[PDB]
Amino acid sequence: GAMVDIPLRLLVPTQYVGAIIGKEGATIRNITKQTQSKIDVHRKENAAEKAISVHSTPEGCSSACKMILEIMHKEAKDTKTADEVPLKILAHNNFVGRLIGKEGRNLKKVEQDTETKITISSLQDLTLYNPERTITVKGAIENCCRAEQEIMKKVREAYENDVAAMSLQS
Numbered sequence: 001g002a003m004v005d006i007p008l009r010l011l012v013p014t015q016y017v018g019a020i021i022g023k024e025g026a027t028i029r030n031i032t033k034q035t036q037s038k039i040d041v042h043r044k045e046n047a048a049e050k051a052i053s054v055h056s057t058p059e060g061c062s063s064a065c066k067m068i069l070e071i072m073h074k075e076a077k078d079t080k081t082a083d084e085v086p087l088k089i090l091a092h093n094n095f096v097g098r099l100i101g102k103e104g105r106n107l108k109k110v111e112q113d114t115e116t117k118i119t120i121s122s123l124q125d126l127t128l129y130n131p132e133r134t135i136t137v138k139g140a141i142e143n144c145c146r147a148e149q150e151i152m153k154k155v156r157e158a159y160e161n162d163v164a165a166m167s168l169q170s
Helices: 014-021 023-035 058-078 093-100 100-114 141-169
Strands: 008-013 038-042 047-053 087-092 117-120 132-138
Touching: 008 014, 008 023, 008 058, 008 100, 014 023, 014 038, 014 087, 023 038, 023 058, 047 058, 047 141, 058 141, 087 093, 087 100, 093 100, 093 117, 100 117, 132 141
Parallel strands: none
Antiparallel strands: 008 047, 008 087, 038 047, 087 132, 117 132
């Protein structure tokens, strides 16, 4: 399909970034070629964490999310650092109402359908120019990725519903 406008944005531990890029960038270029995605790495304004942006199709983003998670787990095990590495997703505060639903029922439903635990950063931790919440997903890799697919479906729909009026008028 067409690459979509809203990227998947992950927050990963800085110490695993070198592993994701790999020698002479061959790991990231491999992920890019297998998933047909544009990937970049940058700071998140609000030290031990870095932002990863994946611009792909929905399926390309989900596949890159799984490859990235597998590398981080490989690297956490291989350095005896951790046996789990939670998946952290960045989503604009405007979209997270829809994902959460009334009294968090939509989020419990994703947690139950995917066999994951999900927690969302506090509203009070946003900044004037950083409107992104962090959604922490814990569980097996395959399960975190199913939750990624569900969350990012909801975020993309909320984005397309919010901008539909202003796209028509032009």
